[PDB]
């Protein structure tokens, strides 16, 4: 009986993580107290501190207030669960002890920055894929509670709205534009998850979303409109012309052919059968003298060239538009 008393038979508590020494408890219920049990004489009561986690704090023998201890780290995030039980002694010289326990609430604050791990990511992707075509996910880890671990994704930069992301599930999809592989054929994308904790921290990723080839785009001639010069006494084999011409797909097989070469007299006539006149190597575009030339027969040639990504994927997007022109005027020999 005579041994010190404590006012509550458990004090409750909480401290936030991280508080730098000296910072005192919050004691939800009253100081920490307890009185000698005799009425007449005075008598100094100290107080104590014990438990597996009392080296994580210093009581004021004196006061018997509880501070956090010079050295020590207290981390929410290494204690499950986050409660610590602690107890107290009183002590008065010549008597039992006091008893009360001190059982403390270790608070969690927003420390951990959402994590993505791996914190960098590649993927391959088709062009001409529809709107709304799923890419990739990504997730980032937080060590914290409640809303400083619920995170929010969002593309900072790279995007243009080509590429969208779910801002919970972290799903990156197309957006309503076309992926062009010729347009575009890569991109870095910055992705940041932010936690919710009025401090909110966040942490990045990069994707880097490599577009694959379908073979989708048509040859364009570069020299599309050409007249030339060539003397009536050329011989066969010779090179009076070069049409040239350039697939943005990945691996092209062009084919220049001639499709058609009208022919007329001096007199601005037709004469016909004079396709046997010129000839385009298929892989070069070199156009060449095929048979002898005679003014007197033809003055001039509108020859058309046209060219075809044999490897194409599309139909509609083989042949050049437009095909190559190459008017001939013929030249004059004479005495
Ligand atoms: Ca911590
Ligand atoms: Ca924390
Ligand atoms: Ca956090
Ligand atoms: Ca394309
Ligand atoms: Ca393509
Ligand atoms: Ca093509
Ligand atoms: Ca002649
Ligand atoms: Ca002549
Ligand atoms: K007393
Ligand atoms: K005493």
Redesign the pocket.
Same mark, same amino acid.
């Given at each position: 009986m005579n041994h010190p008393l404590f006012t509550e038979g458990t004090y409750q508590a909480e401290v936030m993580e991280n508080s730098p020494a000296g910072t005192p408890l919050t004691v939800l219920n009253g100081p920490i107290l307890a009185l000698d049990a005799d009425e007449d004489v005075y008598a100094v009561v100290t107080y104590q501190l014990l438990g597996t986690h009392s080296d994580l704090f210093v009581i004021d023998n004196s006061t018997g207030v509880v501070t956090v201890r010079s050295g020590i780290i207290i981390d929410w995030e290494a204690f499950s669960p986050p409660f610590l039980e602690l107890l107290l002694l009183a002590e008065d010289i010549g008597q039992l002890n006091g008893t009360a326990h001190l059982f403390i609430t270790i608070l969690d604050d927003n420390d951990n920055w959402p994590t993505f791990s791996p914190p960098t990511y590649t993927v391959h992707l088709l062009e001409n894929c529809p709107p709304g075509f799923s890419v990739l996910q990504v997730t980032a880890t937080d060590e914290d509670s409640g809303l400083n671990g619920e995170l929010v994704y969002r593309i900072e930069a790279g995007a243009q709205d080509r590429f969208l992301i779910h801002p919970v599930t972290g799903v990156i999809r197309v957006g309503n534009a076309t992926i062009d592989r010729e347009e575009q054929e890569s991109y870095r994308l910055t992705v940041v998850a932010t936690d919710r904790g009025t401090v909110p921290l966040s942490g990045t990723a990069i994707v880097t979303i490599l577009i694959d080839d379908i073979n989708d785009s048509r040859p364009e001639f570069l020299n599309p409109i050409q007249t030339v010069s060539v003397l %009536?006494s050329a011989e066969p084999g010779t090179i009076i012309a070069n049409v040239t011409a350039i697939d943005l797909d990945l691996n092209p097989k062009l084919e220049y052919h001639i499709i058609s070469i009208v022919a007329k007299d001096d007199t601005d006539r037709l004469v016909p059968d004079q396709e046997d006149a010129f000839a385009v190597n298929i892989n070069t575009g070199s156009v060449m003298v095929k048979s002898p030339l005679?003014? %007197?027969?033809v003055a001039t040639y509108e020859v058309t060239l046209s060219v075809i990504d044999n490897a194409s994927d599309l139909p509609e997007h083989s042949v050049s538009v437009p095909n190559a022109k190459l008017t001939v005027n013929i030249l004059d020999?004479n005495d």
């Open positions: %009536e005679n003014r %007197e027969l020999v």
